[PDB]
């Protein structure tokens, strides 16, 4: 009960990185693009 | 000290335009604003003035016509002052050279803080407009300005006007920026225009369609490169999927 | 065709206008516009503010200053060739009776019909918001012109630099007849012309497209059958890549 | 501002100091020399008062807002947000970020934007609401 305390520590960085990836993916994609355009 | 030049949306536009349509020839105008303390100058406004091929020069200027637009831009309610001028050089990157040194020079001695605008419009297909900003010495309250602090006393004492750059912004208005989204029910009427004679041809459109794909998949069985080989058929799929959805 | 084409400088120096006159409580506001229009294809590439001052329980008193199209004109040929005169601009939101009077002065000093630009300003319309009209006999009556963007290479990318379908299409379409029964209800008020000879006939021309849409479905079936290859196609170059990954990844593994 | 450094956390006594120069030179401003003056005064009388609410510190730097200076009311703007920072105003926030919104001046902004920031300390989801209108 005090050990789901410890497990959440671990499990909540883990959600928070999962969906900071996802957001990423989206702007890399869109820089990619103008980026080729530039070179 | 730090300086900072904010260029306007409709400044950029009339400087782009004049000195593209000029070409080869140079374009030059006198930028229309205010100074604001040490740190930040506006320019809200632009003029063209006539047009120069020798590479601006002092006898070139003229004080008639800078005089007389003023004048007609007063009653139109622009009462605000001559901060600087701007010019092309198609050809030639965005720099000075001493001929536009001499210019500038002059415009210092009558202002005190000046600005040259450079705009290359070959630089300005770069996917990025290259523009520069550019002020000589002329000091008083650029005296903390070009482990250090001999150099730049003894380099304003040694010399007097020597250029440096100055950095970019950009500062514009919510209502410019919502007409430069709305570029890209005329929109409608074309779209869908398109859309409709699209489905007329095709019958035609079907068929050539296959004869690319026949092609892709006999290159693949001799192949056996692979990025073109997969464009062609992305482009294919691709054209499919948006005339199934036209109907 | 009968186009118009308008820069970005057009319109947000019209943008510039309506602040930098102080023009307020849905007032007018004139400028001239300026490109090349000797031709039916007008290209508007330049413009200016014109001193405008309106009464506020008249706008039939006007004062426009003609010495000043006819001065500035002359500073424009100065710097640029392509700068002439072809037609004005005004705030909107609609036309006014008042507007002919000034089409009227406009008339002489240009080598085509007159050019009157609705430019709104107030940036609450849906997609480019200005319309674009030409001032021809009937009276005298406005008439729409189809308006669009225009393009230099420079300009557009400059555009671009300072910023960085079927759902709309169909949207502005309901629209579109949302804004027509508007007009119709109004119209029955007022009665108890040309636009009930245009309901009609819209009418005659759903219903009479249903009997050919079941022609078009046949068609449309061989075209999804044929997409069901092309997935096929692509396919097979999607599955290559996964080999010459797997080569690469067994050789990694080994060293 | 170095009297202010030392002086941080014992600062009871060296707001009341300093403020007499705040009154001193919102009233003088014209030459360089007396804007660089009070810049350290104020980013000075800021570390004297921090974090207490000390309400006529408030008014005095903000009446070197008014006289628009980019030198001076950069330190003046920090300033209050030191000073008010943990609970602070609700006045204080409301004014503050207007100000921003309305001034034509870099260096004001900026320094209002981190005033603003700093008044914040502890205030968990009270805060949420001019974080908005920042972003």
């Known amino acids: 009960y005090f050990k789901l305390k410890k497990l959440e520590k671990e499990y909540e960085l883990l959600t928070l990185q999962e969906d900071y990836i996802k957001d990423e993916q989206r702007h890399l994609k869109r820089e990619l693009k103008r980026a080729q355009e530039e070179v | ?247 | 065709h009968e186009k118009v084409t308008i820069a970005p400088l057009v319109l947000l120096s019209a943008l510039d206008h309506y602040e930098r006159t102080q023009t307020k409580e849905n007032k007018r506001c004139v400028g001239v516009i300026l490109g090349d229009a000797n031709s039916s294809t007008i290209r508007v590439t330049n413009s200016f503010a014109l001193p405008f001052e309106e009464d506020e329980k008249n706008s039939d008193v006007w004062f426009l200053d003609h010495n000043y199209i006819e001065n500035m004109n002359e500073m424009c040929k100065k710097i640029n060739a392509k700068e002439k005169l072809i037609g004005w601009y005004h705030s909107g939101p609609k036309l006014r009776a008042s507007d002919l009077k000034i089409n009227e002065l406009f008339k002489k000093y240009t080598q085509n019909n007159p050019l009157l630009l609705i430019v709104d300003v107030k940036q609450q319309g849906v997609g480019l918001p200005t319309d674009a009209y030409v001032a021809i006999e009937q009276e005298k009556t406005f008439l729409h012109l189809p308006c669009t963007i225009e393009a230099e290479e420079a300009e557009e990318i400059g555009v671009e630099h300072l910023l960085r379908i079927r759902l709309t299409n169909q949207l502005k379409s309901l629209k579109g007849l949302q804004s027509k029964l508007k007009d119709v209800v109004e119209y029955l008020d007022k009665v108890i012309h040309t636009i009930l000879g245009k309901l009609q006939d819209v009418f005659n021309l759903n219903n009479l497209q249903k009997a050919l849409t079941v022609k078009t479905n046949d068609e449309l079936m061989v075209i999804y059958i044929s997409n069901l290859v092309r997935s096929i196609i692509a396919f097979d170059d999607l599955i290559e890549n996964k080999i010459q990954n797997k080569k690469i990844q067994e050789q990694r593994v080994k060293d | 501002y170095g009297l202010g450094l030392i002086y941080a956390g014992f600062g009871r006594d060296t707001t009341d100091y300093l403020k007499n120069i705040i009154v001193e030179n919102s009233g003088t401003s014209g030459d360089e020399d007396v804007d660089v003056l009070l810049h350290g005064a104020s980013l000075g009388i800021g570390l004297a008062a921090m974090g207490s609410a000390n309400i006529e510190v408030y008014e005095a730097l903000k009446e070197v807002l008014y006289n628009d200076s980019a030198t001076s009311g950069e330190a003046a703007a920090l300033g209050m947000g030191l000073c008010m920072l943990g609970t602070g105003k609700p006045e204080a926030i409301h004014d503050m970020f207007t100000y921003s919104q309305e001034t034509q001046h870099g260096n004001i902004t900026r320094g209002l934007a981190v005033g603003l920031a700093l008044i914040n300390y502890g205030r968990q989801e009270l805060a949420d609401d001019l974080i908005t209108k920042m972003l």
């Open chain 2, 1 to 247: 000290t730090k300086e900072t030049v904010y260029i306007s949306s409709i400044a950029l536009l009339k400087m782009l335009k004049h000195g593209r349509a000029g070409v080869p020839m140079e374009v030059m105008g006198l930028m229309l604003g205010e100074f604001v303390d040490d740190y930040t100058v506006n320019v809200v406004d632009v003029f063209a003035m006539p047009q120069s091929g020798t590479g601006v020069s002092v006898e070139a200027v003229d004080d008639v016509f800078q005089a007389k637009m003023m004048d007609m831009l007063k009653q139109t309610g622009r009462d605000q002052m001559v901060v600087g001028w701007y010019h092309s050089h198609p050809g030639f990157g965005c720099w000075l050279s001493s001929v536009d040194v001499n210019t500038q020079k002059s415009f210092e001695q009558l202002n005190s803080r000046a600005v040259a605008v450079v705009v290359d419009p070959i630089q300005s297909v770069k996917g990025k407009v290259v523009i520069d900003a550019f002020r000589l010495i002329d000091t008083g309250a650029l005296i903390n300005n070009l482990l250090n602090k001999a150099n730049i006393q003894a380099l304003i004492h040694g010399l007097n006007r020597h250029y440096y750059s100055l950095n970019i912004d950009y500062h514009k208005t919510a209502k410019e920026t919502k007409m430069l989204m709305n570029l890209h029910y005329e929109e409608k009427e074309e779209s869908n225009l398109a859309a409709t004679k699209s489905m007329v041809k095709i019958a035609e459109q079907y068929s050539k369609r296959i004869e690319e794909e026949k092609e892709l998949t006999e290159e693949e069985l001799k192949t056996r490169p692979k990025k073109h080989l997969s464009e062609t058929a992305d482009e294919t799929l691709e054209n499919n999927i948006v005339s199934v959805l036209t109907a």
